Amino acid sequence: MEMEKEFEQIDKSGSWAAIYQDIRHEASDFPSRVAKLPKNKNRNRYRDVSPFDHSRIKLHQEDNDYINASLIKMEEAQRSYILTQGPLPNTVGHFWEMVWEQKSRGVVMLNRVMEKGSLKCAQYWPQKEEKEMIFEDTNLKLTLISEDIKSYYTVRQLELENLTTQETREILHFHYTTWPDFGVPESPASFLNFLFKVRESGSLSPEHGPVVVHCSAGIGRSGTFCLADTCLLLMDKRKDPSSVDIKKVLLEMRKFRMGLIQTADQLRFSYLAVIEGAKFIMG
């Protein structure tokens, strides 16, 4: 079926939970043996969220190459994404090592450091120009260059220096700051505006490594971001945009990381975002 009328048909029939459970039943199951090794327990935020072995990002390190991060490679859309958990106190150095080694331009953050009164990720970037951060375990230096605070999101320019080689690179930090503590946003308008700002920066384009996107577990809000982006790109590429099937795209992405889209409300929100976004693109 088309999307917008399939949407109204699920609303009128109140069957979002059943649609979402079907997706959960059909989703891929691949091994995640490296994630479960005892030496990696303090590298995982949640015991039930792990990268598959076949698609995990490897650190270029002979001691321990493990990080909780997955490469989502979308062949028809010609887009790739790295989805990862919010960094832990003992993985902030690994996080920036990955950004460097994968040649990423942008980092997309969809959570606040504290939500619901608890810590959802480490404070992994510097908040003042004159107070830079040094990660001694991976030999990187990180400096805040500029910060632009808007009503729904903040964009930061950061400098990452590999202290071994003295090479430097400019990284863009896109921080969506207004996702509610509970539920999903009422309108997708600010989330779509944010997606378009990431696109306009070059951070999603083939001349760079894959964008790094995270929330707390790296599957819920993070899944909503890449699902909406890929569906909109396919609608632009194809002769028949009504042939884009959001459930089929989601199942393709779940071949590369488990659990993408965590609730039936996130699934409904993803439909809403793609529907509204397809009108603004046009024409």
Ligand X SMILES: NC(=O)CN1C[C@H](O)c2ccccc2S1(=O)=O
**Residue number with CB closer to ligand X (122 or 189):** 122
Instruction: Report the site for ligand X in 204-263 (rule: CB under 6 A).
Output: none
Tell me: is residue 221 an annotated ligand-binding position: yes
Tell me: is residue 262 an annotated ligand-binding position: yes
* In the complex, least distance from residue 142 CB atom to ligand X, rounded to whole angstroms: 9
**Residue number with CB closer to ligand X (31 or 89):** 89
Number of residues engaging ligand X in binding (CB under 6 A):
8
Piece in contact with ligand X (CB under 6 A), picked from 120-128, 146-154, 156-164, 247-255: 120-128
What is the CB-side half-sphere exposure of residue 108 using CA atoms within 13 A?
Answer: 27
Instruction: Report the site for ligand X in 126-185 (rule: CB under 6 A).
Output: 133, 135
Determine the 3-state secondary structure of 100 from DSSP: helix
Contact in structure between 171 and 154 (CB atoms under 8 Å): no
Known catalytic residues are 215
Asked whether position 124 contacts ligand X by CB under 6 A, the answer is yes
Tell me: is residue 102 an annotated ligand-binding position: no
Contact in structure between 168 and 143 (CB atoms under 8 Å): no
Q: Is 181 exposed, middle or buried (0-12, 13-18, 19+ CB in 10 A)?
A: exposed
Instruction: Report the site for ligand X in 71-90 (rule: CB under 6 A).
Output: 89
Distance CA 108, CA 195 (A): 10
Contact in structure between 274 and 246 (CB atoms under 8 Å): yes
Task: Dig out the tokens for 131 from the structure.
Answer: 């107070």
Q: Specify the residue for token string 């001694």.
A: 136
Residue least distant from ligand X (Cβ) = 122
Instruction: Report the site for ligand X in 88-117 (rule: CB under 6 A).
Output: 89, 92-93
Distance of CA 189 to the CA centre of its chain: 18
Tell me: is residue 216 an annotated ligand-binding position: yes
Residues annotated within the binding site are: 181, 215-221, 262
Q: Can you give the binding site for ligand X, defined by CB under 6 A?
A: 89, 92-93, 122-124, 133, 135
